[PDB]
Amino acid sequence: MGNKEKADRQKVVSDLVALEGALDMYKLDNSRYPTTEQGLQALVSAPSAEPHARNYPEGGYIRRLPQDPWGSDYQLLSPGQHGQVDIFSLGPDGVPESNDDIGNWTIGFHHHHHHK
């Protein structure tokens, strides 16, 4: 409980949105959502994995892999647990797919994907 945690996780959400944006941008060019490596790298540099991302910004949107303020490298899992691709943050504990793991479903961005 505190103000610190809110500020840290909001910073997490900011990068989280950027992560998903890289995914959407990769989908724009390659007409599909990126895999675990390609998704995180899409913010930095065009993935070497096929198909090779085109129309990518020089230096990327962020020159280095975005990380939780505690020093954790954001993780992507394709195919996602909730959708096609799920992005989650490791938090202070660095543990992926954990309760703490701040994902797009956690914040409330993981919508528009219900077959029912």
73 binds Ca ion per the rule CB under 5 A: no
Size of the site for Ca ion (CB under 5 A): 7
Q: Select the span of 32-40, 44-52, 61-69, 88-96 touching Ca ion (CB under 5 A).
A: 88-96
What's the min distance (Å) between Cβ of 8 and Ca ion?
A: 13
Supply the minimum distance, in Å, between the C-beta of residue 46 and Ca ion: 29
Phi, psi of 10 (to 5 degrees): -60, -40
Instruction: List Cα–Cα distances, 88 to 15, 33, 59, in angstroms.
Output: 11, 16, 24
Q: Which of 39, 47, 91, 103 binds Ca ion (CB under 5 A)?
A: 91
Residues within the interface to Ca ion (CB under 5 A): 90-91, 93, 95, 98, 100-101
